[PDB]
């Protein structure tokens, strides 16, 4: 049954065999049952490394394609794998994760994923296909961003997380430095203020993400 896979995927993770991990966590999800926090994290980490491996390869090839048809074909070979991985996730999202998501925390998280994996497609979207792809990303993010504003404290790690990622979207994909910085400062400056309440530990999860926000801002100015 299912408890075996989660144990089996964690093994793949220590074994740094991320494709097997994604494969297992794919099965735990295709069950139709809403995911456990533990289960979700494991799905997310699995596919982060499977897709991340291709993004790195891609950035590396594409930088060398600039500095020749051989370099291009290899880039396109990479992109096809990238696209598969992304659609695979997006289907699982639309078919299993998002409909089942109950709480706001879950529905935002899966929507931020949706934005994130559409963002990864936008990194390699060429020609005609790009416009359509960018849109489903921003719509995905935006919807999550709105629910988040309704349901979450300025220092909530998921909200802080959505802000960080969705800012990058502006800076990098939309090439809007202003919208992207404007958003990061919004999320960050709210946090510092609310940071009276925080328990030491919460403080840690928050300060961690807030540090990522400022890291980009630093980098962006």
């Amino acid at each position: 049954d299912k408890n075996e896979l989660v144990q089996k995927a964690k093994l793949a993770e220590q074994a740094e065999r991320y494709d097997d991990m994604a494969a297992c966590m794919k099965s735990v999800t295709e069950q139709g049952a809403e995911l456990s926090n533990e289960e979700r994290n494991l799905l997310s980490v699995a596919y982060k490394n499977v897709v991340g491996a291709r993004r790195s390869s891609w950035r590396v090839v594409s930088s060398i394609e600039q500095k020749q048809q051989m370099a291009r074909e290899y880039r396109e070979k990479i992109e096809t794998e990238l696209r598969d991985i992304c659609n695979d996730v997006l289907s699982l999202l639309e078919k299993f994760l998002i409909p089942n998501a109950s709480q706001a925390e879950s529905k935002v998280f899966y929507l931020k994923m949706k934005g994130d994996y559409y963002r990864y497609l936008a990194e390699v979207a060429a020609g005609d296909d790009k416009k359509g792809i960018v849109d489903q990303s921003q719509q995905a993010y935006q919807e999550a961003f709105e629910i988040s504003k309704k349901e979450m404290q300025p220092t909530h790690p998921i909200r802080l997380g959505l802000a960080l990622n969705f800012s990058v979207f502006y800076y990098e994909i939309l090439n809007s430095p202003e919208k992207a910085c404007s958003l990061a400062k919004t999320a960050f400056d709210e946090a510092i203020a609310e940071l009276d309440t925080l328990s030491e530990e919460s403080y840690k999860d928050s300060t961690l993400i807030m540090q990522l926000l400022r890291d980009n801002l630093t980098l962006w100015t």
């Binding site: 926090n37 979700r40 994290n41 997310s44 980490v45 982060k48 925390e105 998280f109 931020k112 994130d116 790690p157 998921i158 997380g161 960080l164 990622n165 990058v168 800076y171 990098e172 993400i209 990522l212 890291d215 980009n216 980098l219 962006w220």
Partner: peptide, 18 residues
């Protein structure tokens, strides 16, 4: 036996919940 220490881009985050 030395098992001891020696030897640029923008950040994005995945949120891993308790």
């Amino acid at each position: 036996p030395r098992i001891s220490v020696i030897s640029r881009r923008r950040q994005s985050v995945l949120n891993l919940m308790t």
